[PDB]
Amino acid sequence: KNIESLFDYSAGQFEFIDHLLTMGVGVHFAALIFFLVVSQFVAPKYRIATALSCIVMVSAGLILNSQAVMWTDAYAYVDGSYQLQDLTFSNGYRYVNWMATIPCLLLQLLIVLNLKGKELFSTATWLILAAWGMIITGYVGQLYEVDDIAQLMIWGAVSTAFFVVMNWIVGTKIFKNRATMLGGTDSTITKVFWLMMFAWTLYPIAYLVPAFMNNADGVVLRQLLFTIADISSKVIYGLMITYIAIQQSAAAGYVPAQQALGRI
Ligand SMILES: *C\C=C(C)/C=C/C=C(C)/C=C/C1=C(C)CCCC1(C)C
Numbered sequence: 001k002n003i004e005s006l007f008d009y010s011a012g013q014f015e016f017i018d019h020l021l022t023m024g025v026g027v028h029f030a031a032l033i034f035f036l037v038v039s040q041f042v043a044p045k046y047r048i049a050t051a052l053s054c055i056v057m058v059s060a061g062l063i064l065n066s067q068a069v070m071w072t073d074a075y076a077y078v079d080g081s082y083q084l085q086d087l088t089f090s091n092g093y094r095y096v097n098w099m100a101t102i103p104c105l106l107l108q109l110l111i112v113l114n115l116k117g118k119e120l121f122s123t124a125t126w127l128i129l130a131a132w133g134m135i136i137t138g139y140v141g142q143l144y145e146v147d148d149i150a151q152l153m154i155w156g157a158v159s160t161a162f163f164v165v166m167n168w169i170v171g172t173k174i175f176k177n178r179a180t181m182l183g184g185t186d187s188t189i190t191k192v193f194w195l196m197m198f199a200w201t202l203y204p205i206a207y208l209v210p211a212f213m214n215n216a217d218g219v220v221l222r223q224l225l226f227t228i229a230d231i232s233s234k235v236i237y238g239l240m241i242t243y244i245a246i247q248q249s250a251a252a253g254y255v256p257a258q259q260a261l262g263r264i
């Protein structure tokens with residue numbers, strides 16, 4: 001049902017995809033350890049943001065590693081190419097884990113924006129509904145990514161609509177809660193917002209790929225468009241969100257955040 005099943009792969013194509021995915025496990029897991037060690041310098045009020053990023057890292061990784069084992073499971077070198085065998089490869093769990101990588105993500109954004117209580121719960125609720133709603137509409141079209149391209153174009157459209165609409169919630173909360181933010185990070189939070197738009201349009205670029213490049217190199221470009229997406233929405237919003245918590249902790253008088261910044 002997915003263009004990946006349609007082709008045989010050069011050895012260079014199959015190896016590049018497999019190193020891509022593996023570089024992936026490597027980075028989500030190495031960043032996994034950074035995210036743990038530095039959590040002891042984040043003040044109690046922000047320390048979950050730090051934590052939330054370990055879930056991101058270990059969702060991702062576990063499922064990224066899943067994809068690379070399935071890639072080698074699915075294909076075997078036969079008469080001069082990698083041909084599809086008895087098991088299949090697909091990108092379902094990405095998505096299926098898109099569906100949960102994000103709650104925790106906008107959650108640790110919302111933490112460092114200093115929201116608390118009811119605005120925090122309420123904002124997170126609407127956000128999860130609409131991201132989730134981007135995530136799932138987009139899931140029903142890549143399902144048609146071979147059979148019915150106008151169903152890619154139509155589900156695409158609707159997911160996008162959901163994407164447009166959700167960057168408004170986040171936009172608004174950021175520009176409205178900038179002023180709350182400590183130790184200089186009111187400037188910083190505007191970068192993460194932008195940082196954040198780039199990686200997430202990579203994925204619609206990553207979706208119209210059957211529509212505009214249905215061949216084996218397109219399969220490759222998807223996955224490339226996949227590994228970067230991931231170093232940014234997961235690994236580098238990751239970090240950037242983390243700096244903000246530590247800086248705000250120092251600004252609010254938390255001595256291990258103060259000493260941590262001082263050391264460097
Ligand atoms: C791993 C983390 C994140 C934040 C992934 C977010 C995904 C998007 C912004 C994807 C959007 C889609 C749309 C807008 C277009 C058609 C179908 C998609 C699911 C690829």
Ligand SMILES: CCCCCCCC/C=C\CCCCCCCC(=O)O
Nearest residue numbers: 022023024025026027030031034239
């Ligand atoms: C075997 C997997 C292939 C890649 C090996 C990965 C291990 C080294 C990767 C680089 C570290 C990831 C980025 C930096 C971690 C955050 C710590 C920091 O920025 O101070």
Ligand SMILES: CCCCCCCC/C=C\CCCCCCCC(=O)O
Nearest residue numbers: 012013016220224227228229231232
């Ligand atoms: C911003 C995220 C950083 C992601 C780094 C991903 C690294 C990709 C590395 C360089 C691409 C060079 C590709 C050469 C591939 C040719 C493929 C082929 O064999 O046909």
Ligand SMILES: [Cl-]
Nearest residue numbers: 043044045046
């Ligand atoms: Cl605190």
Ligand SMILES: [Cl-]
Nearest residue numbers: 060094097098
């Ligand atoms: Cl994922």
